[PDB]
Amino acid sequence: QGEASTCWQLTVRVLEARNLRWADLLSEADPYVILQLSTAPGMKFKTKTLTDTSHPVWNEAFRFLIQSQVKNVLELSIYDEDSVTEDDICFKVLYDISEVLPGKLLRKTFSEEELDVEFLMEETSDRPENLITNKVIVARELSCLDVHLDELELVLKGSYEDTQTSFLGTASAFRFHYMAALETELSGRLAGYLTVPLRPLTIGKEVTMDVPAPNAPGVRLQLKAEGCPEELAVHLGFNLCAEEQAFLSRRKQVVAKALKQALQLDRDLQEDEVPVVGIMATGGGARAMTSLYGHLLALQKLGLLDCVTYFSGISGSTWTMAHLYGDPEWSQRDLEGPIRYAREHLAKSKLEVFSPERLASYRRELELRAEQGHPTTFVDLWALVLESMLHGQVMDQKLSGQRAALERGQNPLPLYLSLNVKEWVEFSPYEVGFLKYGAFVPPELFGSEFFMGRLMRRIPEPRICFLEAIWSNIFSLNLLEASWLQPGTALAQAFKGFRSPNFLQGLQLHQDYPKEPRLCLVDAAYFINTSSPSMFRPGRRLDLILSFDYSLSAPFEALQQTELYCRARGLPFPRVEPSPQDQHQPRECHLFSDPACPEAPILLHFPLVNASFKDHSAPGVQRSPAELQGGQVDLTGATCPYTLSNMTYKEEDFERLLRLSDYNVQTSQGAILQALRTALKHRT
Numbered sequence: 232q233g234e235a236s237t238c239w240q241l242t243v244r245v246l247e248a249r250n251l252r253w254a255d256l257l258s259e260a261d262p263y264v265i266l267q268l269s270t271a272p273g274m275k276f277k278t279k280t281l282t283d284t285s286h287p288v289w290n291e292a293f294r295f296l297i298q299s300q301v302k303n304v305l306e307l308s309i310y311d312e313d314s315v316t317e318d319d320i321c322f323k324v325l326y327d328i329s330e331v332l333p334g335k336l337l338r339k340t341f342s343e344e345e346l347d348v349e350f351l352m353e354e355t356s357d358r359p360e361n362l363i364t365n366k367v368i369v370a371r372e373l374s375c376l377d378v379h380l381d382e383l384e385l386v387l388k389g390s391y392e393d394t395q396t397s398f399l400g401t402a403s404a405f406r407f408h409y410m411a412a413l414e415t416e417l418s419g420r421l422a423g424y425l426t427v428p429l430r431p432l433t434i435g436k437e438v439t440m441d442v443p444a445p446n447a448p449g450v451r452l453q454l455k456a457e458g459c460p461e462e463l464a465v466h467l468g469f470n471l472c473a474e475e476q477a478f479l480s481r482r483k484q485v486v487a488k489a490l491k492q493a494l495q496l497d498r499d500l501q502e503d504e505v506p507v508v509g510i511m512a513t514g515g516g517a518r519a520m521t522s523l524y525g526h527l528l529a530l531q532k533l534g535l536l537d538c539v540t541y542f543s544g545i546s547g548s549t550w551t552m553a554h555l556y557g558d559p560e561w562s563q564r565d566l567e568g569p570i571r572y573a574r575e576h577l578a579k580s581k582l583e584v585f586s587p588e589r590l591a592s593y594r595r596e597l598e599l600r601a602e603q604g605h606p607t608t609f610v611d612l613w614a615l616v617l618e619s620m621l622h623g624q625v626m627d628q629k630l631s632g633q634r635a636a637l638e639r640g641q642n643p644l645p646l647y648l649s650l651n652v653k654e655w656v657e658f659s660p661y662e663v664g665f666l667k668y669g670a671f672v673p674p675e676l677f678g679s680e681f682f683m684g685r686l687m688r689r690i691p692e693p694r695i696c697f698l699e700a701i702w703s704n705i706f707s708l709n710l711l712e713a714s715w716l717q718p719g720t721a722l723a724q725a726f727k728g729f730r731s732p733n734f735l736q737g738l739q740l741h742q743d744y745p746k747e748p749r750l751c752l753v754d755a756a757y758f759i760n761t762s763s764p765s766m767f768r769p770g771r772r773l774d775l776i777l778s779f780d781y782s783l784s785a786p787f788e789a790l791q792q793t794e795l796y797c798r799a800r801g802l803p804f805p806r807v808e809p810s811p812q813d814q815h816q817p818r819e820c821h822l823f824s825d826p827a828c829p830e831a832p833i834l835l836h837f838p839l840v841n842a843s844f845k846d847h848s849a850p851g852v853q854r855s856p857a858e859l860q861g862g863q864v865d866l867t868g869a870t871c872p873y874t875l876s877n878m879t880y881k882e883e884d885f886e887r888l889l890r891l892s893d894y895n896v897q898t899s900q901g902a903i904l905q906a907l908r909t910a911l912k913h914r915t
C-alpha cells in the first residue's frame with residue numbers, strides 16, 4: 232500500500248528569452264514568465280515583468296519540491312503584460328523534469344522564439360514523504376490545517392478548498408486539505424493580510440494569530456496542522472473487489488446447475504471447474520437495444536443464459552441492460568414482458584419529448600439540480616430527454632440498487648463500459664472505476680466530490696438515466712436531416728438564459744509508469760468498439776466470450792480493435808482473420824479459437840446479418856411462402872429503419888430485427904454447446 236520516498240529540491244532559473252513576437256500596432260512585448268508544475272496545482276511563480284523587449288533578461292530563480300516517484304511536468308510560458316486587457320500568451324512549453332539528474336546542473340534552450348533555463352536538483356534533509364500507491368496511481372501525502380474562531384477570509388493556495396469565509400463571530404471552525412510537500416502559506420483578513428507560512432514535510436505546531444478588524448475588536452484564531460484524519464474512499468488496486476469475488480461463488484453454482492442440464496452431464500461440477508462465460512456487446516443506439524433483447528431471448532429459450540457469469544455492453548446495449556436489471560429476477564422471468572415495454576416505447580412518437588411541457592420539467596429539474604452541487608452539462612439534458620424517449624416518465628432506479636439482482640447469483644454481473652475524455656471507465660453495481668488506473672469507488676459515491684482519494688462531500692447517487700447519458704453520450708463537448716434540425720431550435724430557444732471534476736481529483740501518476748464547429752462527437756472510438764476491456768480486467772479469467780455485434784457495416788471491426796487492445800497488453804487472445812468470403816457475406820456465428828494460443832478465451836461472434844433467416848422462420852424450419860415478408864429485414868440501402876439516428880421504430884420493424892436476432896443465436900445452439908464443452912476442459 233504505502234511507500235516512503237524523499238523529495239528533491241529543484242531550482243529552476245529563468246535566464247532570457249529571444250525573438251519574442253510583438254503585440255499588434257507596432258507594440259513590443261512587455262514580457263514575463265509563469266512557472267507551473269502539474270503536480271503542484273494552484274501554485275504559480277511569475278518573473279518580474281520587463282517592458283518593450285524582444286530579448287528579455289530576467290535571470291530569476293525559483294524552488295520547488297519534487298517527488299521523484301511521481302511524473303512531474305513543468306509548464307513554463309511567456310505572457311505579454313497589458314495594463315488594461317488580459318495578457319496574451321506568446322510562448323508555451325511543457326517539460327518533463329525526469330531528464331534532470333541530482334547534482335548535474337542542466338542548461339536548456341526551449342524553442343523563432345527561444346527561452347533559456349537552468350535546472351538544479353539537490354538532495355534535501357526532510358523526512359521522506361508518505362505516499363499511498365498502486366504503482367500507476369499515487370496519492371501524495373496530505374496534511375490538514377485546522378482553524379478555530381475564538382467577513383473572515385482565509386486563503387490557502389494549493390489546497391482543495393482554495394479560500395473559505397464565515398460571516399459569524401461565535402465558535403466557528405474550518406478545515407483545509409493540502410499536500411504535505413507544498414511550500415505555502417495561510418492568509419487571513421477581515422486593512423491588512425496576516426500570513427502564516429506552512430513549510431513542507433514538517434510537524435505542525437499550535438499557533439495563535441489575532442487578526443485585526445478595521446479598526447474595532449480583533450479576532451483570535453487557533454491554527455494547527457496535522458495529517459488528514461480521513462481514510463481513502465477510493466480503492467487502489469488491480470484485483471477484483473470482495474463483493475465481485477463473493478458474487479462469483481454465488482453465480483458459479485447456478486451456472487453449474489444450468490450447465491449440467493444443458494450439457495446433460497455425468498456429475499455435479501465443483502466451483503473451480505465452472506467455466507467463466509461472458510457476454511460482450513457493442514453500441515448502436517436503438518438497433519443494439521432491440522437486437523440484444525432478441526439475443527437474450529434466444530439464450531433464455533435454450534437454457535443457456537443461466538450459464539453466463541458476466542454481461543457487458545457499450546452505449547445502446549446498456550439501455551437494454553439498465554431496464555432489465557431494474558427487475559431483480561429478469562433472467563428468470565419471461566423476457567417477452569420487457570420486450571413489449573421496449574417495443575411500445577420505441578413505437579411511440581417523439582414529438583412531445585420536445586414539447587414545452589416537458590422542456591419546462593427538464594429545465595425545472597436542471598435548476599433544482601443546479602441549486603444542488605452539480606455542474607450542468609449537455610449530458611445532463613441528454614439524460615432527461617433519453618429517459619423520456621425510453622420511458623414515459625421519470626424512472627426512480629439507481630445503479631447501486633441492481634445489487635438486488637445479484638444477491639442470490641440469479642443474474643449475470645452487468646458491466647457498463649464507458650469511454651471518457653481516452654480512458655475506459657467500467658460501471659457495475661459493486662464498483663465504478665478506471666480500468667487503466669485501477670481506481671474504483673462504489674456507485675453511490677460516483678458523482679460525489681473527492682480529493683486525493685478522499686471523500687470531501689457526499690452527493691446523492693443519481694437516477695440511472697444520468698449514467699445512461701454518460702454511456703450513450705453522443706454530443707460534442709462544445710455545442711456553442713431536416714427531422715432533428717428543428718428540435719434543436721425548440722431546445723435552444725427554451726433554454727436561453729443559462730467544469731466537471733471526477734473522483735481522481737488530486738491524484739497523480741507514478742513515475743516508472745478554418746471551420747470545424749461540431750454538434751456531435753466524431754472520434755471513431757466512440758462508435759466502433761465493443762466491451763472487451765471489461766472482459767479483460769485483470770482478475771476476470773474468461774473462458775468463453777459470446778460477442779454480439781450490432782454494426783451495419785464492418786461486422787468484425789470491434790473484434791480487430793479488441794485484438795489490438797489485447798496485443799498491446801500481452802493478453803492471450805485468438806486472432807481474427809476472417810476470409811474474404813466471411814467479409815462479404817458473413818454468417819450467423821463465427822468461431823475464433825486459437826489452440827495455437829493457449830489460455831486464450833474461446834470466442835463466438837455474432838454479426839448482425841440476415842443470411843439464412845431469409846428462408847427459415849425458425850431454427851431448421853423452412854420458411855413458408857406466406858411468411859416470406861417475415862424474413863425480409865431491411866438492413867441495407869436507403870430508408871433502412873435501423874440507422875443510428877433513428878429513435879422511433881414501427882412495431883413491425885422492431886419485430887423483424889428482434890426475431891432475426893433471436894434466430895441467429897438459436898440457430899447456433901450447437902456451436903455454443905460445442906464451445907461450452909470446450910470451455911470445460913480448458914478451465915480444468
Ligand SMILES: *[P@@](=O)(CCCCC/C=C/C/C=C/C/C=C/CCCCC)OC
Nearest residue numbers: 514515516546547703719757758875876
Ligand atoms: P451509442 O450507441 C448511442 C446512440 C444514440 C443515438 C441517439 C439519437 C438521438 C437523436 C435525438 C437527439 C436529441 C436532440 C438533442 C438536441 C440536439 C440539437 C441542439 C441544437 O453511441 C455510439
Ligand SMILES: [Ba+2]
Nearest residue numbers: 258259260261
Ligand atoms: Ba509594449
Ligand SMILES: [Ba+2]
Nearest residue numbers: 313316317318
Ligand atoms: Ba492583465
Ligand SMILES: [Ba+2]
Nearest residue numbers: 377378379404
Ligand atoms: Ba478542530
